[PDB]
Design a protein around this nucleic acid. Structure first.
Length: 983
RNA sequence: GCGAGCGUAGUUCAAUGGUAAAACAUCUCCUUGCCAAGGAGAAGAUACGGGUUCGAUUCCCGCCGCUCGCC
């Protein structure tokens, strides 16, 4: 029959005992996971080999739900296996485990989807995958690299089965209380009331001060026993203190600001138990050993680097910096070739260079060295440089001559190219090619070489002969693994020109652009067989392509009564978590009860559809309960939960922040010049803002912040524009998203971004680093795009003098004069990379930098004027009276008068100044300026020609100074003309 | 938190294994004087430290600053 719950264990722990793991027992203290058991956190540190495997429950109380939802339990059993050192087969033993416990691995769909692991409390992290059998995540698989705070050597492999998410799939059961434990008895009929009334304890009746005391008591005892040098009890007390913190957090007694203190209090206990254990081991001497460690026509050249499953976006950025790094070094070494072409797959990165040469080019080239001054001399030609110049080239020293190299120097000679057979060249240069590829996250598995996933085979051939070398303990050869668990899981390719034809004879489609066209072209037949078509945003196809090797699509049905949910929760479940394709009927274009999934390989396609249909019958069944729990109360009541989300420590939660916005959004609608008959209809849509952030859905689907506020608002019976404005307080959410277009949608999206700037700035967290906490870059970058894309006239130095007045911490006039600069630099960077010149955007941003729309308007309109032949007339016309007045003690400020203006050309210059200054007002555009100064430039050169400005008289020489101070100051407000070149 | 790319006169930019160039700015000499303009001349730099090589601005390592993605 089927596997019961105890046979699963009785077979897993004897299979893993045939391999060689010791089989221990669980602990006797409450833990939350398995990786914190005393014998997998302590005993991975050191040189000590530790193959072990055990079974333990895990108790985490904040997941207690009275035992009703069929997936979450407050006490669930695991199965943990740790292998140190990494044996090498570490994921071909796993798939023998699976078919050992009665699974048919040639029939289901086993997928290795990447998921890293990190935990700051223990101070550990590692890289690895999670295993999807028919859509269900069943197992985690990790290589460790830190533990405590000291790096690991050698690294450990951790495999952690979860034995109640496996047994519901292997048995056709939807609710855990129907799982057959042994022949006759059920799982519910053993653990139901423990599930039911330990929840009431961890959830309602836990005495919450006799735990607050026990936390500190355990902390003190573990800190004391770390001074008699006793690691064992000094860690058990850490275990039973981090337990008592969990049933504090569950009861809700931990506020919002104590968590950052509790985590710190308990992290430095595990951080310093580790350094004691690793030493008390080595004072014994490590009683468990120690870990120490030809000429012919051209032929093709193929190089493949097998791997274990890379992420979906480490194939794309590593199939480029390999082909480029090969293109360079093929010609750096004087070798000729043809059509070079790369490829990719989750577990191989191939490159093909066609008809590669057989020898180097072998031509003689000139080469000039040091000048005749340094090396050559009269009767002293060889000093110390000529010999060094001929030694590295071994040409005889009397084979040199001179050339007019600028100054008729630099003696030189010829050299040779030294043909080297094109297969002893690559031996020297390939390892530094393969070692060149660099990723953001990277591993170590058996040495100090770094890569993103372990390399398992290298297939590098040329013609018929093998290019021999070694990288990371693997000697290159001519074998390759095909589609896993098939008849061609290992083949050998003879000649490098029948590589591709052999590869696709084992099922693999390696050409990346011909997997997209066999996904999106066998999905359409399915979607049209039912009546509709797919929804494939090309940010999802680029991540479904690189999860598969030989694709195969399948349609599946889910229930119709789930169609009452919002459309944008159905599609987000089906896309961002399971990676499916929704289906919409192309007549009346809303959703249908179908989905399309992409299997991988030789699949039964009768069990995988039936297995996938029953996972999003469960995720939908949870989201529907959340939704029905969220329509129990009117939306205006979800505000008063907001006071339990942290924003920043010394300034507080989110409820106070949204409190500080209703009181200022009544003026930012006057700075932008918004119509009067909408300043009412904004403010009531300002109290409801950011309310959905405490909802039940949005805590689960944290990407629906903003959608599931408009959905509730419209349903409650508000206006349309209120609900629509309740959505664009979040736009834009990343780089390249739509901006707020409606009128009351700008006010709020601007008023929020003013606060999150002025508060975070005037309260310590300044971005002065390469480190970016709190995202102060994009928050400051979006505030200028909401304006330059929307034709709005703003004042950055008045709004920041008014949205800083509200904060709880005091804001002095000096700290808002750096926010303006941190915004202006961002505007300059936005403006330069639009194909603008760099010198004009620094001559408009000196006084037009306040209103970010007029600046971006008048900096594009100034370059086109700079390229016309009036720029050199104006930039000089205004430079003749600003240099001549570099300081001569002009004291009588205005002085522009006819008191004594007995000058000849003054009487015709001041008139021109008045008739132009009557046009140029402090906000004029650049063209009226550029046509109003061209007629002023002549009386200038008719004034300077005659009048001797400098003082031949004592008092009356200030007219002649003010009359030019004015003509010099006219462009104050339009452009700072003393920076542009050509002055 | 991690990666990626960068750093040359005062501002912008060429070059590369072995006399670091040019533009604008600055200075002096000219005089239908003080501004501008046309002419001659002069001075001025590889962020910093370390490594090989006879010689590194260039190849290698380490420190400081800047810009950009993810967290």
């Amino acid at each position: 029959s089927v596997l019961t719950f105890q046979q699963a264990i009785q077979r897993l722990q004897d299979y893993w005992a045939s391999v060689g793991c010791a089989v221990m027992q669980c602990s006797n203290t409450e833990v939350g996971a398995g990786t914190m058991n005393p014998l997998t956190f302590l005993r991975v540190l050191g040189p000590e080999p530790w193959n072990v495997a055990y079974v333990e429950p895990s108790i985490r109380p904040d997941d207690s739900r009275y035992g009703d939802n069929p997936n979450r339990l407050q006490r669930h059993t695991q199965f943990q296996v740790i292998l140190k050192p990494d044996p090498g087969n570490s994921q071909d033993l796993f798939l023998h485990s699976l078919s050992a416990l009665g699974i048919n691995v040639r029939e289901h769909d086993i997928r290795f989807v990447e998921d890293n692991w990190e935990s700051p409390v223990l101070g550990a992290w590692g890289l690895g995958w999670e295993v999807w059998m028919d859509g269900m995540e069943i197992t985690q698989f990790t290589y460790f690299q830190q533990s405590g705070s000291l790096p690991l050597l050698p690294v450990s492999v951790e495999i952690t089965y979860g034995l109640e998410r496996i047994l519901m799939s292997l048995q056709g059961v939807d609710h855990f209380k129907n799982i057959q434990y042994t022949k006759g008895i059920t799982y519910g009929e053993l653990f139901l009331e423990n599930e039911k009334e330990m929840s009431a304890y961890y959830l309602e009746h836990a005495n919450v001060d006799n735990i607050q005391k026990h936390f500190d008591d355990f902390e003190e005892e573990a800190r004391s026993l770390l001074s008699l040098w006793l690691p064992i009890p000094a860690y058990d007390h850490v275990l039973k203190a981090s337990h008592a913190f969990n049933i504090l957090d569950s009861r809700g007694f931990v506020g919002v600001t104590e968590r950052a203190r509790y985590f710190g209090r308990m992290r430095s206990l595990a951080r310093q138990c580790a350094q004691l254990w690793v030493k008390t081991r080595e004072n014994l001497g490590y009683p468990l050993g120690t870990y120490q460690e030809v000429v012919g026509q051209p032929r093709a050249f193929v190089l493949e680097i097998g791997t274990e499953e890379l992420p979906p976006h480490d194939v794309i950025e590593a199939t480029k910096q390999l082909e480029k790094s090969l293109i360079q070094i093929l010609e750096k070494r004087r070798l000729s070739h043809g059509k070079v072409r790369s490829y990719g797959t989750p577990r191989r990165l191939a490159v093909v260079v066609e008809n590669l040469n057989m020898k180097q080019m072998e031509e003689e080239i000139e080469l000039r060295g040091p000048p005749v001054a340094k090396a050559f001399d009269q009767e002293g030609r060889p000093t110390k440089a000529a010999e060094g110049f001929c030694r590295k080239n071994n040409v005889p020293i009397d084979s040199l001559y001179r050339r007019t190299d600028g100054k008729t120097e630099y003696i030189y000679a010829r050299v040779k190219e030294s043909a080297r057979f094109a297969d002893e060249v690559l031996t020297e240069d390939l390892p530094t090619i393969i070692s060149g590829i660099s990723f953001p996250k990277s591993m170590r598995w058996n040495s100090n070489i770094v890569f993103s996933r372990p390399i398992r085979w290298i297939f590098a051939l040329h013609g018929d002969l093998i290019v021999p070398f070694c990288f990371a303990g693997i000697s290159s050869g001519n074998q390759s693994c095909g589609l896993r668990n098939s008849s061609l899981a290992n083949f050998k390719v003879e000649a490098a020109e029948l590589y591709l034809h052999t590869l696709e004879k084992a099922g693999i489609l390696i050409d990346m652009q011909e997997r997209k066209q066999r996904i999106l072209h066998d999905s359409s037949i399915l979607a049209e067989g039912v009546g509709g078509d797919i929804i494939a945003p090309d940010s999802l196809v680029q991540e479904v392509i690189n999860l598969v090797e030989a694709p195969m699509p399948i349609i599946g049905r889910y229930d119709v009564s789930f169609l009452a949910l919002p459309k944008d929760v159905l599609i987000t479940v089906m896309q961002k978590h399971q990676k499916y394709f929704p289906v919409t009927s192309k007549t009346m274009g809303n959703l249908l009860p179908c989905f399309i999934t992409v299997a991988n390989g030789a699949i039964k396609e009768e069990v995988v559809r039936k297995g996938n249909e029953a996972v999003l019958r469960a995720r939908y069944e949870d989201a529907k309960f959340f939704y029905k729990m969220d329509t129990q109360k009117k939306l205006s009541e979800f505000r008063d939960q907001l006071s339990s989300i942290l924003f920043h420590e010394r300034l507080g939660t989110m409820l106070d922040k949204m409190k500080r916005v209703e009181n200022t959004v009544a003026e930012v609608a006057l700075l932008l010049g918004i119509n009067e008959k909408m300043i009412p209809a904004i403010k009531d849509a300002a109290a409801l803002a950011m309310s959905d952030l405490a909802t039940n859905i949005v805590t689960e689907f944290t990407s629906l912040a903003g959608i599931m506020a408009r959905h509730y608002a419209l349903r409650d019976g508000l206006s349309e524009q209120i609900a629509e404005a309740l959505f664009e307080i979040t736009l834009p959410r990343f780089s390249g998203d739509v901006f707020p277009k409606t009128d009351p949608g700008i006010v709020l999206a601007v008023t929020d971004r003013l606060d999150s700037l002025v508060g975070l700035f005037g309260a310590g967290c300044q971005p002065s680093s390469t480190n970016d906490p709190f995202g102060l870059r994009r928050i400051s970058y979006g505030l200028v795009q909401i304006l330059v894309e929307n034709k709005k006239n703003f004042d950055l130095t008045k709004a920041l003098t008014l949205v800083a007045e509200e904060q709880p911490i005091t804001i002095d006039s000096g700290v808002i004069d750096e926010v303006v600069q941190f915004v202006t630099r961002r505007l300059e960077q936005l403006l330069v990379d639009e194909g603008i010149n760099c010198e004009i955007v620094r001559s408009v941003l000196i006084e037009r930098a306040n209103c970010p729309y007029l600046a971006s308007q008048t900096a594009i309109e100034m370059e086109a004027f700079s390229r016309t032949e009036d720029f050199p007339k104006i930039v000089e016309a205004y430079s003749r009276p600003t240099r001549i007045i570099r300081g001569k003690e002009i004291g009588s400020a205005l002085e522009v008068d006819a008191s004594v203006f007995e000058k000849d050309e003054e009487r015709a210059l001041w008139s021109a100044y008045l008739e132009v200054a009557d046009k140029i007002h402090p906000g004029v555009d650049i063209k009226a300026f550029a046509d109003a100064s061209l007629e002023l430039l002549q009386p200038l050169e008719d004034f300077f020609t005659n009048v001797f400005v400098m003082a031949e008289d004592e008092k009356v020489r200030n007219n002649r100074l003010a009359l030019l101070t004015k003509v010099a100051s006219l462009p104050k407000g339009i452009a700072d003309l003393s920076v542009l070149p050509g002055f």
